[PDB]
């Protein structure tokens, strides 16, 4: 299926022997775990941008949107834990590491220095459009999976992002932002 | 559709040019928006209601009910910020003037001084029923019109209506209370 | 007397056979009670209004106004109680349903959504500026009316609203906000 | 004058030779003086009767009353301390003896066991009727005497004690409380 | 001897070879015993007692005794762990299954709905009577059986039952409570 | 017996019919009520008369003084309610008012204002030798009359008045100490 | 008038055009904004002069007044920004550069290191009378300006002050104390 | 008697006029202040000796056992000031130099690096062991010297050591443990 | 040497016969005691500034400064009583008169009503750049003295005041910013 | 220089123009920002390392291991955001992109799933080795650079890391660790 | 080296195969060692001479110099398990039994009962005098041993003894303090 990447349960090693899906069926798990391992590695990753764009925005604006980043990172952060606990939960491994983020995250994470307000926020929402709707679709693709317990979590998700979308939009509807 | 009242994103204004209902169709949107903004101004108008019976009430239940319905508001008032971000989330603008709280509102709100126990906490379960259905039906609308994030919404605000329902009901199952 | 709206001490009704002004006249109970009604509708009014303006404004300048409308309904809000429970220790009966709101409030709330940055702060300041002048005109009046009680309630929420006043004036103190 | 069990400025003591009335000329100091030493007997008086009141409710009104006389004990005691002070501070020595409490206060203590509700609230709403009007015209009487700083603290209590008054005014208006 | 049931010192399982009666002769230790895993299982009865009658309660009193259990609860809750521990620290293990429960506990919880706040009061007043006297009496043995530190913590038990007995048995010390 | 005038349980009255001395027998509850009726009045006194010297006392020890009664009086405070409820618990009715706080009390609350540092501490060293061995005479009499709840109590009053006697003895134990 | 040196009101500079005196007439504002800049400065002198003194105290009354002082610039110092804040509401600019304070201040802060107790304490009460005796009079003149508002702050100030003021003079009133 | 070494009551020094036994014979002090020095020596030495064990301990269990220790350390820390505080209120020294801790303590401090986890915890389990029978044993002398108020502080603390024991003796009662 | 205006060991006055420079040759502390007294001065400038440039600004940034000038005095407040502290402990008298911030710092408060943002924020970036390349500077020199505890107290402040700086320069790195 | 990568004081864009590296000179900037990037993307991956080890660790450690990376995530985190703003503060631009973290991080994030509770320990310790080694380098080559500030930093850094290596060496330091 | 009664890194015991002193070579770790078991056996020995001290002063001076010990007290407690974990880390054994700290403290703690305040505040200061001179010099040393971690920790308790040394001080420069 679509989630060996994630998949623990039929690891050859040590401390595995009861790994298992739970009361997933081996095609839902595979389902899930494509979700969560694939918004796991868009939550850091939206860590690290918002970070990015925190530490290189300047001009008048600064305040902003410095203060503001901090105050979506405070919001998302906890989902990361909590994501990649559910996966564990099912049977899996969540992956971490650098290439992993790169590979599965739907949100890439600025290499340059971004300095110009518009650039971030414009970025930003086209990001957080994605995701928003990655959490409901996901939500729903779940609920199909008898997994109605990580669908549930999603939906939670789904409105802090959606939260941020309608800020930052906003912000940037302005023509005077140059 | 049923929400033109609540749209935002289709107005003849500045500052607006990105306004959108994100991933809801637009006829997803109005079935949506209706309940939210019904549903805000219920919420508010509940909040109107308890702090008038909580003013007005007298007599020897009075620490019982002035008490309550200031726990009762606690538990409710998040619920007006939420709903009303929801709604501007998904392209809303939310309406909170007097005029509109009484057009929208499912929950009328008292002119009169009532003193009674019995009248307002009456009054106060008739309308915690129907609120309660109301976010019950409410949840499953959303959900079938592809807004899961919504009625999770929902069904944590149909929880508390029923349990506050609930006591309510409790204290007036009495033939002494006259 | 002017106050006959708030008045609850010559009711025919239930539980009521004890209400009185306390130490008040009539007439002092008329000019105190007339201040305390308008106030509690117009300190509802501002919530309400703070909040629609905090939903629906858009632009550069969201950040500064959204979160400055909730610091400043955090600093009145605690007055709503404060006023209608001193309107009830005197012998009156506060009315806060949309009707009576809108009736009694010197501030309107808006039924249209107002994207634009400095229509809602000229608003907001032409209001605050009322509002302010009502609470110093108030307090002297109490005074006179051998209430220094409430007198000193009021001198407290003008220098709250004073100060929101200043802020909001000082913003708009910029022919660079269109 | 009327304040010389209060006054301390004239005493044949160690350890006394710098006290005085402060900015009030000794007339004033003796109208103010007067009013602080009954009001701070009042109020501790006041809170051992809600603690007998309290020890002694039975009945079905128990958890009401019990839990109430508490409340508003927690709401009067800090005003024990900030009285004396005062009068400390312009030159009295508070009095706080039992005979002392008994002579100068306008509350009296009970001395039996008052089993009865309607008994214990309607004693303790005249007793509030004649404090917070006590409060008002001291304030008015301090302010006269060139002495705004004392009548601002009267204005704070008799706010909080015709709040009291109201609440318990309300519960006994009740023919169904024997 | 009389705590066999609760003696972990003797038992024939891994594990368990250093386990003893501490500085309590074999005698002494089944007179400390008896009391704690019968005090032990009376606690975990008296939460789900009230419990049962917090979630049962209807009519005009439930404001009263629905939130005055919970008070309850939050009073006696520590002791279940402190109690049971003691018993561990002393060599025996405590029994908690249902049926052990009922065997030992000298409260009994209801099977049946008690809508009525006499019959609830009532049975928890002759409960509180037995517990609080017991607990009285177990002090004074343990203390003869040369365990002082069990008796102080039963000492400190016996207060907040007698506490709590007086308060339900005030409420119900009339007769318009039917 | 000796507590005739703490006893509620005898009392021609109403809502007084279920009042006993639960697990006492008569003259036990007369021994226990005498000592409770009499540490409550004294303790009462004691926050009164280090109220009295705190706000009385001038002087290079102003601040050592002024600040350790207030600490003294915080330790102390939870007392007065714990007795007195204690006595409650037992089929007592506790007194307060100004009068039997006089007759009931082993310390005498100042009448006049005493300036001098010496004077107050020695009083108050006396006042304290004189409480503190009668918690410890009382707790021996509470265990004694098969109330070692009640000496439970007193064991941890002695110690803070104890302790506090330590405190105030050490500062005065000093020649240059006019 | 006699506040030209902070009236903020009539100046030519940018950001300026809407600043006014709110609700009050120009010598109102005149008369206030005198009163709030001189107890701005001063307030700020005194804090520190407060510091100064705590940081050279030395010898035996060293932990009496280091602490102190500490304690009541801790009551002092949330006046300051209220105070400077109540001047820009009124359309005034505080003024807070050393020149500034020097002009403005009533309370002159050392240049010179004193290490005597005596000497800082009287200083320091001459100081508080001042002080405590200008809020007083300053309230009467604010309130006679048709500012009950900034009255009010000032019927506070002078409360913390005054008791600031008995706090010193008593310690000082030893002649013990070289 | 056996407690000179602690005893202050006749010693030739300044500042010692006033020292006494309090409500204790000469004898009884004599009792209950040798167990008082004795357990605050055995006290800090515990304290000592638990960091030591934490600091040095290696191998799989560090984590067990290096958390484990400080929470026993936090149960018994307070102990430290209670302890000295009541012999110093009786009449006593509290002697605290490492000398006097060796020589009075029951519990010696290791000066070896002890990396064993069974080492460690079989001879912390004997150290507990005699600890807790010795404040079981000291309570009852307490009494019986006519304090019971230092018997109830043993008794609690006699509570804690035993569950420290009982948590330390089951880590080890296990052969894996090598 | 260069910080005898700061030095307190060598004075003509009472309770000063111990005072030295602790660990520091005369020299050292010379060298030492001349950055903190500029260092103090500075800091409490920059207090004073900040709280002037925050009343002041008016336009549209007024939210980002007003509310930045705070967060800033709130990093660098605690280091003013740091700062004067540290000196004392060297042997050297803290000067805080408005006549010795003057003579002292190196940051200069505004007398004039500075309403512009650019302005405001081009000098503070230039006072912030002076002041943490002087305390980089001054922590060599300590260093260099002999002193890394006075240097170590430098770095931590150095990082503030770049960090600060950094958030300044960026707001204003911006031409749309007039 | 060798930190071109995360200099920002020459690039081609917008918002720039004031960027520099304060009082470093370039070469010495070069030297400070090569060990703040390096250091960031270290500490970043090993958060995210100790994520990932933490969520798969399996056997009898887990609860050991679980629970200490836990801890010592919540030691190293706030560095990021530190590190980061320092290279902010000099002139840098921080990367935080997967991308650069592999290629700065002296710390690689495990791609599969290590079960081994010894594999896992021993990586980390050597992990730990290199990096608590790198920053006690890195603080002496900031402090010859000119750069005392974020040596200081560097050196609270080392003290936290160099513990978590004592821990997780002392935990695998034992042969019954497979 | 002059450390081997700490150095722990080359004995023949079990579980110790990996002590090493990470990043210093031997003579480094030698000398830092003696510093860090020495500074641990002084922070001990002062902990212990602050308590004795606070529980035997007597006199005039009781509360000033009993408070302040406590306080000063919980300023350097902190630094034990600081210091001691650092050793730990660096491949050391703390040693903390009585004997130890008797042998490698700087600070000797007191076997008789020291009334006086001079007595005991003459011996504090010299104490901590040499105390924070050996935290600057061990400080200096440590930087020369390349391990400027160490350095940034003594840099602290330095400022922390100082701090102490001068309040300590300044009370006792009194000709009146006999
Ligand atoms: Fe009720
Ligand atoms: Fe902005
Ligand atoms: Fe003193
Ligand atoms: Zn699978
Ligand atoms: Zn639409
Ligand atoms: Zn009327
Ligand atoms: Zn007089
Ligand atoms: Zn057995
Ligand atoms: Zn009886
Ligand atoms: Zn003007
Ligand atoms: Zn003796
Ligand atoms: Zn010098
Ligand atoms: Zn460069
Ligand atoms: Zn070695």
Redesign the interface.
């Known amino acids: 299926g679509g989630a060996d990447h994630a998949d623990?349960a039929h690891?050859g090693?040590?401390?595995?022997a009861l790994?298992n899906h739970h009361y997933l069926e081996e095609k839902e798990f595979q389902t899930v775990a494509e979700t969560l391992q694939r918004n796991l590695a868009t939550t850091?990753?939206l860590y690290?941008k918002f970070?990015?764009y925190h530490?290189?925005?300047?001009?008048?604006?600064?305040?902003?949107?410095?203060?503001?980043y901090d105050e979506f990172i405070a919001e998302i952060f906890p989902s990361?834990?909590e994501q990649?606990?559910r996966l564990?939960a099912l049977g899996g491994?969540?992956?971490?590491?650098?290439?992993?983020?790169?590979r599965y995250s739907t949100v890439?994470?600025?290499?340059e220095?971004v300095?110009?307000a518009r650039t971030q926020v414009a970025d930003l929402?086209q990001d957080l459009?994605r995701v928003?709707?990655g959490?409901?679709?996901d939500?729903?693709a779940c609920?199909e999976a008898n997994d109605p317990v990580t669908?549930?979590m999603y939906?939670?998700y789904?409105?802090t992002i959606?939260?941020i979308?309608?800020?930052l939009?906003?912000?940037?509807?302005?023509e005077?932002?140059?």
């Open positions: 623990a690891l090693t040590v401390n595995n790994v850091i990753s690290l970070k990015k530490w290189d925005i300047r001009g008048r604006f600064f305040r902003d949107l410095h203060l503001a990361i834990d990649a606990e564990v491994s969540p992956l971490a590491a650098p290439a992993d983020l790169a890439q994470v600025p290499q220095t300095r110009d929402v459009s928003g709707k959490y409901r679709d939500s729903q609920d669908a549930d939906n939670g789904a409105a959606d939260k979308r309608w800020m939009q906003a912000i940037m509807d302005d005077r932002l140059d």
